[PDB]
Design a protein around this ligand. Sequence first.
Ligand SMILES: Cc1cc2nc3c(=O)[nH]c(=O)nc-3n(C[C@H](O)[C@H](O)[C@H](O)COP(=O)(O)OP(=O)(O)OC[C@H]3O[C@@H](n4cnc5c(N)ncnc54)[C@H](O)[C@@H]3O)c2cc1C
Ligand SMILES: Cc1cc2nc3c(=O)[nH]c(=O)nc-3n(C[C@H](O)[C@H](O)[C@H](O)COP(=O)(O)OP(=O)(O)OC[C@H]3O[C@@H](n4cnc5c(N)ncnc54)[C@H](O)[C@@H]3O)c2cc1C
Ligand SMILES: Cc1cc2nc3c(=O)[nH]c(=O)nc-3n(C[C@H](O)[C@H](O)[C@H](O)COP(=O)(O)OP(=O)(O)OC[C@H]3O[C@@H](n4cnc5c(N)ncnc54)[C@H](O)[C@@H]3O)c2cc1C
Ligand SMILES: Cc1ncc(C[n+]2csc(CCOP(=O)(O)OP(=O)(O)O)c2C)c(N)n1
Ligand SMILES: Cc1ncc(C[n+]2csc(CCOP(=O)(O)OP(=O)(O)O)c2C)c(N)n1
Ligand SMILES: Cc1ncc(C[n+]2csc(CCOP(=O)(O)OP(=O)(O)O)c2C)c(N)n1
Ligand SMILES: [Mg+2]
Ligand SMILES: [Mg+2]
Ligand SMILES: [Mg+2]
Lengths: 571, 571, 571
Amino acid sequence: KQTVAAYIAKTLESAGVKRIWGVTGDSLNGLSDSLNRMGTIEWMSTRHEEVAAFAAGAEAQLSGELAVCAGSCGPGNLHLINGLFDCHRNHVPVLAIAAHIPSSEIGSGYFQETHPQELFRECSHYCELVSSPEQIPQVLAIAMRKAVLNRGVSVVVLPGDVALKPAPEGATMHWYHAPQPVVTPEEEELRKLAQLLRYSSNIALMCGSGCAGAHKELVEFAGKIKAPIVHALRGKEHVEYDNPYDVGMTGLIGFSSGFHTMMNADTLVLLGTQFPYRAFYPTDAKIIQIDINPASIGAHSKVDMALVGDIKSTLRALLPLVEEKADRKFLDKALEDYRDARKGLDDLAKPSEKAIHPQYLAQQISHFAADDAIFTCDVGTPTVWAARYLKMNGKRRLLGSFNHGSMANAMPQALGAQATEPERQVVAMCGDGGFSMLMGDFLSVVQMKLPVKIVVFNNSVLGFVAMEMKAGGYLTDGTELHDTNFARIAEACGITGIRVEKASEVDEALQRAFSIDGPVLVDVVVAKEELAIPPQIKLEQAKGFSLYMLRAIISGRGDEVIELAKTNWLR
Amino acid sequence: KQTVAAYIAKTLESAGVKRIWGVTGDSLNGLSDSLNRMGTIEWMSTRHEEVAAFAAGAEAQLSGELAVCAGSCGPGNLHLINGLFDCHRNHVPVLAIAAHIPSSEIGSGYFQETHPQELFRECSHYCELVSSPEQIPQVLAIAMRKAVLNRGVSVVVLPGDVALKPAPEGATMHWYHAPQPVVTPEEEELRKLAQLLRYSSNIALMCGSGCAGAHKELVEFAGKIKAPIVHALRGKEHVEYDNPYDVGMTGLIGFSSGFHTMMNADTLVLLGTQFPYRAFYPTDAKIIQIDINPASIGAHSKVDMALVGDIKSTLRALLPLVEEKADRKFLDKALEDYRDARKGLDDLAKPSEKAIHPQYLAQQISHFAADDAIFTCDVGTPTVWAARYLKMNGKRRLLGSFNHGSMANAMPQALGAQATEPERQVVAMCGDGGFSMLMGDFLSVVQMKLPVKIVVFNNSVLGFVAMEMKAGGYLTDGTELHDTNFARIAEACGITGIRVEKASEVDEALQRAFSIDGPVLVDVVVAKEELAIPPQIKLEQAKGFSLYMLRAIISGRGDEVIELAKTNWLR
Amino acid sequence: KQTVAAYIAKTLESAGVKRIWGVTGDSLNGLSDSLNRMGTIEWMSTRHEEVAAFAAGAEAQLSGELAVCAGSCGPGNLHLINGLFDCHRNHVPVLAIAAHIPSSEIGSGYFQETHPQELFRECSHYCELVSSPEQIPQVLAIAMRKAVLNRGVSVVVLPGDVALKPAPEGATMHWYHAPQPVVTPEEEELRKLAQLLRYSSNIALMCGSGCAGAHKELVEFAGKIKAPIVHALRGKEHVEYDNPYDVGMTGLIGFSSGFHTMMNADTLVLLGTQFPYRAFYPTDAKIIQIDINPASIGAHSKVDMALVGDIKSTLRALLPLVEEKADRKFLDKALEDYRDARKGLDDLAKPSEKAIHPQYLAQQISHFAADDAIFTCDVGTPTVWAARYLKMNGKRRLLGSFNHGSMANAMPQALGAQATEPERQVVAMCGDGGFSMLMGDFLSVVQMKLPVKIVVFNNSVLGFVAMEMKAGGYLTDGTELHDTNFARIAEACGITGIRVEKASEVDEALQRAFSIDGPVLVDVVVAKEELAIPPQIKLEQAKGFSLYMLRAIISGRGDEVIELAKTNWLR
Ligand SMILES: Cc1cc2nc3c(=O)[nH]c(=O)nc-3n(C[C@H](O)[C@H](O)[C@H](O)COP(=O)(O)OP(=O)(O)OC[C@H]3O[C@@H](n4cnc5c(N)ncnc54)[C@H](O)[C@@H]3O)c2cc1C
Ligand SMILES: Cc1cc2nc3c(=O)[nH]c(=O)nc-3n(C[C@H](O)[C@H](O)[C@H](O)COP(=O)(O)OP(=O)(O)OC[C@H]3O[C@@H](n4cnc5c(N)ncnc54)[C@H](O)[C@@H]3O)c2cc1C
Ligand SMILES: Cc1cc2nc3c(=O)[nH]c(=O)nc-3n(C[C@H](O)[C@H](O)[C@H](O)COP(=O)(O)OP(=O)(O)OC[C@H]3O[C@@H](n4cnc5c(N)ncnc54)[C@H](O)[C@@H]3O)c2cc1C
Ligand SMILES: Cc1ncc(C[n+]2csc(CCOP(=O)(O)OP(=O)(O)O)c2C)c(N)n1
Ligand SMILES: Cc1ncc(C[n+]2csc(CCOP(=O)(O)OP(=O)(O)O)c2C)c(N)n1
Ligand SMILES: Cc1ncc(C[n+]2csc(CCOP(=O)(O)OP(=O)(O)O)c2C)c(N)n1
Ligand SMILES: [Mg+2]
Ligand SMILES: [Mg+2]
Ligand SMILES: [Mg+2]
């Protein structure tokens, strides 16, 4: 005997949601009232709803549990969209409650009329309009279940008037927490795979976030067959610690070693991955892909053998079927290549007379940050530096907009994080473009008392300078940001602001920002690091290729792009 | 290496498709040429593309293997839509190749311009436009995989010009047939379920098509705990043979027994089901749902415990954890109720002085049809009669538009069937509305040499006559079909036509139609059977409920709707 | 001949676009290069793309000419969406260039994959994906034309690779500026209307933005038949100056006079309007609607006579057919009622001992602002105050998100404005929620050297406090903003910041902010003004009505909502 909104709120509480991120409107009165009368779920008001979505995503990513955000009708919920894409593409359980204009006015071009039911189709698993209160029990049941079990976004579109109507009287608000099933491939499929591996000399693994929770099984497997392990970016935090077979990552921002490893493998085995750079994959090697989601299978390479399976349970069952290989010439050669590849990683990662090198900053961040710190990195150079310098260990974490690829993710994701783990240290490696893109929500660290440690890579620019040639006469209005003082801004927002201009000052700023009890923004003025490009590659680019689409990589030094050549590892 | 079309066709052949259903256009020349030069995949030309879709669905349903249909650009592929919905809603693997207008003209309101990429979003798991031939390998890989492994429709939209361009040279055409994984819930979840079952007295099962292939496990489980088994319509062919615990089906067209069984159960266990009639579900019983697809869970009832799981492997694991219950008072009372409920099923199922009773026809069809015949039934009364009279045995099959609920499915599905199993007997129980709705494709049984046995329930009407009161003054233009002679039409199409007007002639017509070597249409003139409705129910209907939404059922006799009353069973 | 991007850019230049608002990406390299090599169109880089859209809209609104914005692939262009809705709903010509992921990767879940072609359907007149460079000439031709002539948004979705390919060689880049036609209803329709008006005693007009450019014709017509003129908000700047028949506006934020005027009219004539509050319209009066867009006709009221027509040319033709009415008892009574209604408008609009009253601030803004200043107001209280206190005169202008109803519009629209009219004074009446919602783009007034005068109504809250009852125990996290100092923030961004806390200081701050040569943010701390609501109305609200949906208005004083009662006017 309650409102539809109340019914939703109570069901959510049973499912265990602790908070709902968003921004109020009249179209959400039903939900507000219920939330207030209930006093159990905390309303996290943000300054732009886009940040609410991002945060919810981060919260879900860290907690592993359903997270919720909401938006008023019209522009309210629409503001969620970019964030929801990030949630969805990052495979985290997020329910989004999109309040809607009053039923009666629908179809008449009413004030604020949008069609959320339609808009969010792409960034969701489920998206329905609750026209009649009678449908709330089944609509919500599915939405939640899919979001949670299919690992993604669900959207419930709820007109303000409907939300205030009485929920069905017989409806159950109790939620049964149904965990993922055990999904392992058939014994026959496994036996095939084992024969296949047994007949392959140079075996290689490309590992992604799908390998989370399976680290033990992963290394054991790799060890048993002496197969090197390359990882995709999102697999970094789950794979690149305690790993004797680590050959790093590849792609433009990784290291050549991983590429050469796959181009010299007889058999390449994709394990829970969506590594998207098709040109980095062997053309004439047997590619075997294991993944829990059929839609992943062959999205980015050919597949000679595909197995639907949970990486953990699959490897558990596969191990007894795979005999120990003793030959490790391939593995050793790879490891060697990777060590040789991190040559020059240190080149610019040191204190400097003039401008501060980004790589130095990143190196120091990884050094002084907590051994269990949660990092976030803006899409832009912070993502490059975060991926190359942050040392993972299986306690620390790394969030970013790695699949949806949105600027300005770093701080908003950081809010989400901090709120979920208020005891833990959260470090946002932000761009100055990205920090300013959603700068309003900086005010949220104060208002929400969330002690995130923002570190802006203040380079007064959007991305690597001179994507071709340093320009002494040309200056695209596109890449140039007006010299700004974010420490000064942090200060005027009621947050500790540390401005850093000399390399000598870095270690001090970081150490202090981390130990201070509260929000700190560390405005570090870094160099406008350039990226030299071979004229041969500039040529390819004009045909319609980005550096990500070419067989090209950023050097360990980080100041130029070089062609990956065919390297046949001697017989 | 070849054309994009050829690449597709060859990949399909590797995956083992034997035929592609559709209707040619210039927009499909690439595909035609390739198909012709290849000579391996048979092009099944239909008269309306809608039937190609339907057929493909039936082919997929029977074979359990990927099936394909295609349509020209514009109206061509659009004609598929209704059929594709049926394929999709029936959970069968179907790839639809939707030819598209020439790239260049897109966006200009060209001759035949539609946007297939958008239109089929709802009836599909995957829907993409192949703009550049470069994307065909990954687009097709995903489409096929999803279609096959997620059990549904995928759509590839392919402009005629793109189809003629060269496929990527490095592309692999070999397909690895990856089977479904073994998906069973965790041991702890199972233990909970077992303890739950162990402390329940009156346990009941509602079983759906998800139980296919698990008949042995099903009965054993039901037997062990002495739990009666009600089935949903689509579970009929997989559940209602060799089943000591059979309590029939419910819903408007079933029998009361199933309803009373659930309303008197302490614990109700949904096994692979999507039975949609929410009012037929117990309000105050523990509902436990097992299903392979999280989106199914709680779609139509509350769920106190939900388990993601394959019904077969789940029951295999659950059995050793469930101790044998000896008390079977509940089971026995149910069985009794069901036998008591098929009272009057025979009432009208006998030869008659005047018009021929539909129930008689159906009874006789089930009697003279092959012991392994494949049936199909039009949405309409043929669905009612097919469900009540066809005796299943685990060899026979039953296809219909049970979820998408489209008229005129019977014959087109029948074509699909016959083509997949040319040795087998296929019987289409068609409505006269449904047979005429896509009557053009009757010409396809000739042209395709497919010996389907059409049986039209010629009642000169759309559905049950007098959904309220026989009208001696009123006659809605809505329900009345102009007296037609389909035997005569069959004859003029080059197909054996048997006209049947006297009950005495039925057994002879059927026996002959089945034994003749080829297509036979049996035009049976059946009664305009009425459906009396209590004035109390007519009242409810005016509030906005159909008979499916009420706690109401059709009598065993089949000539009136009666309210299901609350029934309590002693001890 | 050149690249597709260049082709676009050059065509745009011919059409006369002066700038393109957005934020760069690699997916826009083609467009960047062309823009740079061309040096004619200025790239206005914003901090969030949402603001680029908003601005473009404001630029289009002011200039009356096509305006353009653009976004990178994926999150880039998606950031435009909310703004584009505002552009579209405000009926302004805006082309949006949405860069897209590389063709080849489409359909594979590539990095940043979205489907812009679909997403923007709702906020646009035209939305197409340029797959082949061959289609750019017709796609762009239509997009531009529709955008311009149908007065709304068009979207061209352009993959980065396609943009770099050669445009069709034969393509014309010259644009013919085709002006709107003369659209007047047929003489017979006009004669009917004239006879209708001739036999009506109490005639009333409700006028909207459609009346722009027709002020002379409007008053003359109203004068001739002695008909009072109520206006909709968006008609304000075009109607409420030099108007002897002005009866103000209605709706929640207007004045009762307009409502009573229509409820006492025999004939009500809607002129170019989309006033959306259906409850404010007479039930028993002849409603006559004239509008240029058939979709407007009857959207919000019944229509006894509808005429498709341009308000200007229609009135020109209608005048000679309408004989002068001498009776003006109705008109006079209305005018009187309106003067009586602005009773209490002044109540709180004066210097105060304690907190500063918003109405005072607004009154003073209208007083010290330029006689031809361009205002903008955030959705929220600034919209209320802007509408009640800003005196229009036919030179000044007023922009807001009046139809799409988005927070945070004020400043971003203000940027657009200032850039289009760099000589003119632009005043953004911003909320503190709205200013902070897109606060990043505050950095744009510096970087773009745009001397907008921001005036924040710093009330530390979201909207009217206590939408029911001041809460001395309750405090919704929903409405409460953490006390912030925006003057201090303005300062740290390199912009003059004036903090204002005492009413006595207002006139000085305003006068100085306006005369200073450059950006000034005036952070005025205003009262948390309350809005008392009758318990009778709170009741109605719980049924599912907002104050906008009820026959209710905000008092002239502005501190409470009062029910509009039925009023009958003698003779
Ligand atoms: C600026 C920038 C540059 C980048 N450059 C690079 C680069 O050079 N190198 C690089 O690697 N990345 C790079 N990326 C990131 C890249 O876009 C992808 O995010 C990353 O490559 C994908 O990692 P993943 O496959 O682990 O991601 P995810 O999408 O997280 O992988 C999850 C996959 O595993 C499957 N899965 C999940 N759970 C299980 C399970 N239990 N069992 C089996 N399967 C499971 C899922 O179905 C899915 O397919 C870059 C990103 C940015 C922003
Ligand atoms: C005119 C008409 C009247 C009808 N009246 C009735 C009626 O009176 N009574 C009635 O019952 N129906 C009736 N229906 C049919 C009804 O609409 C449904 O189609 C049917 O009831 C549902 O059957 P189902 O649950 O087996 O459906 P399906 O959709 O076939 O059920 C499959 C479910 O099992 C799951 N599943 C599949 N494979 C597995 C697996 N390996 N492991 C675990 N789970 C799996 C799927 O996720 C899905 O949820 C009628 C239809 C028509 C056209
Ligand atoms: C917080 C808030 C509160 C609000 N409260 C109120 C309120 O109390 N009162 C109020 O009035 N508004 C209010 N509004 C605004 C309201 O939502 C509408 O935006 C506004 O009322 C409608 O103005 P309009 O009819 O001029 O709109 P528009 O959409 O600008 O009207 C244009 C109409 O005229 C037609 N037209 C255009 N050109 C021509 C032509 N040449 N010839 C003929 N026809 C043409 C168009 O087809 C269209 O139908 C509020 C807005 C906000 C944000
Ligand atoms: C919303 C959005 N707009 C544009 C892009 C394209 N893009 C990617 S990185 C980048 C520059 C990022 O600048 P900044 O935040 O300053 O980080 P930097 O690379 O300079 O460290 C742009 C414009 C994007 N990925 N997302
Ligand atoms: C395309 C379509 N139109 C309408 C309906 C609704 N409908 C269901 S059964 C039916 C009558 C079917 O008539 P017929 O084929 O004669 O079967 P009968 O019940 O008469 O045997 C209609 C119109 C539907 N399900 N599908
Ligand atoms: C994006 C968005 N979110 C929510 C709303 C609903 N809404 C309308 S006004 C408002 C408060 C605006 O606050 P502020 O900017 O402080 O203006 P004030 O009324 O406080 O002056 C909200 C949340 C909206 N219109 N748009
Ligand atoms: Mg930067
Ligand atoms: Mg019939
Ligand atoms: Mg405010």
